[PDB]
Amino acid sequence: GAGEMRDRIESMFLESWRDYSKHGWGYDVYGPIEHTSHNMPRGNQPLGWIIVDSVDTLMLMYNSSTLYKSEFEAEIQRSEHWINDVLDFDIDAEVNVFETTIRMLGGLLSAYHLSDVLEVGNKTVYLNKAIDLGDRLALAFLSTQTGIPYSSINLHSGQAVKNHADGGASSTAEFTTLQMEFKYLAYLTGNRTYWELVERVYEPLYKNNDLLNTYDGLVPIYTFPDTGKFGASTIRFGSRGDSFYEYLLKQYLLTHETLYYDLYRKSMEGMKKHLLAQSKPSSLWYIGEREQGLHGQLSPKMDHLVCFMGGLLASGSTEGLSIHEARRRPFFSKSDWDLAKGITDTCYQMYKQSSSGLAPEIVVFNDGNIKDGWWRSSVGDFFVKPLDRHNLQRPETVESIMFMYHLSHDHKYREWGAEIATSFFENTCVDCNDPKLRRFTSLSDCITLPTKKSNNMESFWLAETLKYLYILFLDEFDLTKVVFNTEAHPFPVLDEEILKSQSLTTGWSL
């Protein structure tokens, strides 16, 4: 039953949360096995990495819990007071602009939103925190002439610093996955600067590289900030590439700016033409990589991160509408929808065909040219390299499953989600037979049985994985009124007329 699954997911969240609160409260990094923790900044000041990333999940569960509503409420209060009284972003330390924007700025914005629409807590606490952090992060856009930011920035001084490696090139997805956050902040503050700075990165990216014509909208993962030109690098929908595509569509869903939908469409058709393929022997659809330009060979290697594509494609085709209604709209893309189901199925198979029921960090699909020390899936559709056997509690597959269920209403997706939730429960638990001490942790190896545990709980286990599994089992969730940032922090769809009155419009074109 949905309500029961709800109780179980809330239970898992609380088991992880109670343990974290008891042993690593206020710390950025936490290891459940040994109950150890530390902060990321050299000076040891906290960034709120886990707390801020988890607040909105607490609010969502508080809103529908029937067994622990009171506990969730108290924890929201605990988190809010800490964010208001302890957390301080005036830190003399360099932080990754992308991660801090999607997790911290995004989490504060979604906490504000949910605090607002759910009337729980004090939304002002989160908004004020978001404005201050947003200002510290925004200084990154002043470093280059192109407007493309360097990878890191000092939260106290505002000094920017290039990527230590890759010849100093920035990761393409890292500066193209900041738009939802800064645009929503612009909307809440009426401050156009946030919007202008974040939209600026696209023109040099598209124009200086002849992106549409030469690359069919597919981006190499590295781009030099000073020139805006791509560096010799792999073209993949995995890490450093993935969210560039995500935010093209999501900006359109959030602000109604059609230019981004058009760009998204171009990239999607390019993806279908150069990266799409099917595995043997189940003919599972998968997106491959091109390490040597579009004219090079196609690699069947696929990061689990690519699995977010199921939900993205479904979202872009339906615009949040249940297919019943979407199928009759002019904007509905039959191709995107069929592929969304296909990719979600493939990603589910990465769990179903896994010895532990959990998909590893990276897999290599069987393209008929898999000819050593690799592990073969149950059906043989993919292999797992010895070095990619870990599982970091990633959400991308349950993410897509959630979208597919709410848009299609096909109960099969809830069955898939339940199986995966069960696999996480049984294969990542520590002190599995004691509800009072049970916790969940990452795996150094999810292929060997019993699985081998790693002493680390990712903030996204709480911010994303458990959140999406939870939403999957909510009977009511209108995907036309919300747009999730890349760390699963929900922002409301913005009113076009209000954006216009605030002079928040597309400041460039192509």
Cβ-Cβ contacts under 8 Å for 121 (sequence gap 6 or more): 59, 76, 77, 80, 111, 115
Min dist. Cβ of residue 484 to Ca ion (A):
8
Q: Rounded CA gap, 366 and 359, in Å?
A: 16
Among ligand NAG, Ca ion, none, the one that 278 touches (CB under a kind-dependent 5 to 8 A) is: none
Binding of ligand NAG at residue 448 (CB under 6 A)? no
What is the H or E stretch that residue 384 is in?
Answer: strand 382-384
Binding of Ca ion at residue 191 (CB under 5 A)? no
Nearer residue to ligand NAG within complex by CB, 11 or 84:
84
Give the contact letters, 59-98, x = binds to ligand NAG (CB under 6 A), - = no. Answer: -------------------------x--------------
Environment class of residue 366 by beta-carbon count within 10 Å: exposed (0-12), middle (13-18) or buried (19+)?
Answer: buried
With H, G, I as helix, E, B as strand and everything else as coil, classify residue 370. coil
Min dist. Cβ of residue 55 to ligand NAG (A):
15
Q: Which of 199, 319, 361, 458 is catalytic?
A: 361
Number of residues that bind Ca ion (CB under 5 A): 1
Ligand-binding site membership of 146 (annotated): no
Nearer residue to ligand NAG within complex by CB, 124 or 292:
124
Query: CB nearest ligand NAG: which residue?
Result: 124
Q: Rounded CA gap, 418 and 426, in Å?
A: 12
Candidates 167-175, 420-428, 485-493, 500-508; binding stretch for Ca ion (CB under 5 A):
485-493
Q: Which of residues 122-141 bind ligand NAG (CB under 6 A)?
A: 122, 124-125
In this structure, the number of other CB atoms found within 10 A of the CB of residue 343 comes to: 27
Nearer residue to Ca ion within complex by CB, 5 or 362:
362
Candidates 40-48, 133-141, 257-265, 480-488; binding stretch for Ca ion (CB under 5 A):
480-488
Residue 94 falls in the annotated catalytic set: no
Q: Which two tokens stand for residue 56?
A: 């909105």
Q: How far, in Å, are 59, 246, 451 from residue 121 at the CA level? A: 9, 31, 39
Min dist. Cβ of residue 123 to ligand NAG (A):
8
Candidates 46-54, 119-127, 134-142, 461-469; binding stretch for ligand NAG (CB under 6 A):
119-127
- DSSP states along 186-228: HHHHT-HHHHHHHHTTHHHHHHHHTHHHHHTTPPBSEE-TTT-
Cβ-Cβ contacts under 8 Å for 480 (sequence gap 6 or more): 319, 320, 321, 493
Cβ-Cβ contacts under 8 Å for 119 (sequence gap 6 or more): none
Nearer residue to Ca ion within complex by CB, 24 or 360:
360
Q: Rounded CA gap, 66 and 408, in Å?
A: 27
With H, G, I as helix, E, B as strand and everything else as coil, classify residue 362. strand
Q: Which two tokens stand for residue 204?
A: 């040099």
Binding residue (CB under 5 A) for Ca ion from 316, 486, 490, 499: 486
Min dist. Cβ of residue 485 to Ca ion (A):
8
Among ligand NAG, Ca ion, none, the one that 486 touches (CB under a kind-dependent 5 to 8 A) is: Ca ion
Min dist. Cβ of residue 122 to ligand NAG (A):
4
Where on the chain is the footprint of ligand NAG (CB under 6 A)?
84, 122, 124-125
**Residues catalogued as catalytic:** 361
Residues annotated as binding site for Ca(2+)? 486
